[PDB]
Design a protein around this ligand. Structure first.
Ligand code: EO0
Length: 259
């Protein structure tokens, strides 16, 4: 590539990300005074473990659906073969959401936006996976300390998705070329904006792996305890990405073909 081509890459990633945001940043900032009462928190903790899991998996699936749309609008993603598109989404959709999630987190009061209002991690006690929850909160805290801009989140989440080290890729070099181009783009925008100091503060890639792995493992425990709940009330797409052997569902293929 070259300079104008890299700066055009920057604008197009930023555009693709704006169009496939679930929630505008300003909508989430305007809502930060809107915080679950202690009575509403108590109501969340008294919800059954299985209904809370169903509600969280539903919200997570909705978030993942915008990540699929981000990828379909991302330069060069749709020139990749369908196997590689699917491998990249299967490994990275959760990761992209974990990163996008820091926009919904308030580091002043350590709350996250959830079902209309903001609540600390005690909101999620009924899940019985406090470790996974505090890790997600800790991770979102550390990303909020960096004061990402929206443009930076778009360029970083594009690299989270386009990772040429995902096992199972069939055109690894083609993904490597794509990755390298987005890294140049990311790093060029940081240099232009005097923000390269964040490079050494970004999370190691192992951290995102670790968070997804925790998620999948707690899902497995839960699915052993409530196998019919998962079968009957979790979203098909969620099951395709996260449970075993839930990829009998082929939703991603459908999402990727549909214009
Ligand atoms: C860490 C606690 N925790 C979970 C733990 C386990 C499973 C699911 C969740 C979970 C889901 C949400 C959620 O989906 N809330 C609505 C929402 C909409 C748009 C945005 S966004 O615009 O930043 C783009 C994704 C952000 C949040 C929030 C917090 C959550």
């Amino acid at each position: 590539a070259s300079l104008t081509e890299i700066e055009h890459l920057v604008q197009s990633v930023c555009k693709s990300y704006r169009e496939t945001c679930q929630l505008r940043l300003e909508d989430l900032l305007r809502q930060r005074s809107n915080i679950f009462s202690r009575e509403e928190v108590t109501g969340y903790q008294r919800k059954s473990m299985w209904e809370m899991w169903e509600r969280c998996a539903h919200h997570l699936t909705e978030a993942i659906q915008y990540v699929v749309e981000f990828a379909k609008r991302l330069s060069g993603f749709m020139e990749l073969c369908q196997n590689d598109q699917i491998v990249l989404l299967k490994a990275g959709a959760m990761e992209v959401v974990l990163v996008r999630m820091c926009r919904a987190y308030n580091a002043d009061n350590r709350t996250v936006f959830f079902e209309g209002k903001y609540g600390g991690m005690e909101l999620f006690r009924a899940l019985g996976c406090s470790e996974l929850i505090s890790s997600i909160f800790d991770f979102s805290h550390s990303l909020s300390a960096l004061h990402f801009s929206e443009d930076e989140i778009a360029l970083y989440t594009a690299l989270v998705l386009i990772n040429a080290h995902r096992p199972g890729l069939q055109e690894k070099r083609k993904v490597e070329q794509l990755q390298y181009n987005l890294e140049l783009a990311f790093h060029h925008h940081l240099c232009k904006t005097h923000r390269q100091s964040i490079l050494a503060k970004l999370p190691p890639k192992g951290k995102l792996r670790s968070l997804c792995s925790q998620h999948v493992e707690r899902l497995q425990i839960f699915q052993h305890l409530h196998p019919i709940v998962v079968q009957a009330a979790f979203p098909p797409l969620y099951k395709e990405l996260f449970s075993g052997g839930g990829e009998k569902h082929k939703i991603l293929h459908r999402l990727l073909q549909d214009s």
